Each structure stands twice: as structure tokens, then as C-alpha cells.
Amino acid sequence: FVNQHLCGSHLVEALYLVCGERGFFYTPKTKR
Amino acid sequence: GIVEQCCTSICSLYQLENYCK
């Protein structure tokens, strides 16, 4: 493995691989 | 939070494991 930028959908794709789609919540920003 | 940190800088699997349940 190597460290890389993962913005937006790319972060969710990595949580998907790390957790196995089990139940993550990334705390997306609520501000307008 | 990881959703901004991994956009603005390089990410890690150790840091992402905090958000899984």
C-alpha cells in the first residue's frame, strides 16, 4: 500500500474496502 | 474530519478504520 489523496467518492470507495460496506459514517459537513 | 483531511492531504487505511461500524 501507499498514501494518496481520496476526495469525496474516493474516500467512500476506501471505507468500502476497509470495512466491507458494513456500516460506515464519514461525518459530511452540514454547513451551506 | 477524514472527509476533508483525505481530500486536502494524503489519506491512510489506519485513519479510515475510525469511521467503520
- Domain positions in chain A: 1-32
B3 Cβ partners below 8 Å, 6+ apart?
Answer: A11, A26, A27, A28, A29
Name the DSSP letter for residue B18. Answer: T
A7 Cβ partners below 8 Å, 6+ apart?
Answer: B6, B7
Pull the grid cell for residue B1: 474530519
* Distance set, CA B9 to CA A9, A14, A26, B13 (Å): 15, 15, 16, 14
Give the span between the Cα atoms of A19 and A31, in whole angstroms. 27
Experimental method: NMR
Interface of B with A in 1-21 (CB under 8 A): 1-4, 6-7, 9-13, 16-17, 19-21
Interface test with B, best of A18, A19, A30 (most B CBs within 10 A): A18
* Distance set, CA A14 to CA A6, A25, A31, A32, B7 (Å): 8, 13, 24, 26, 12
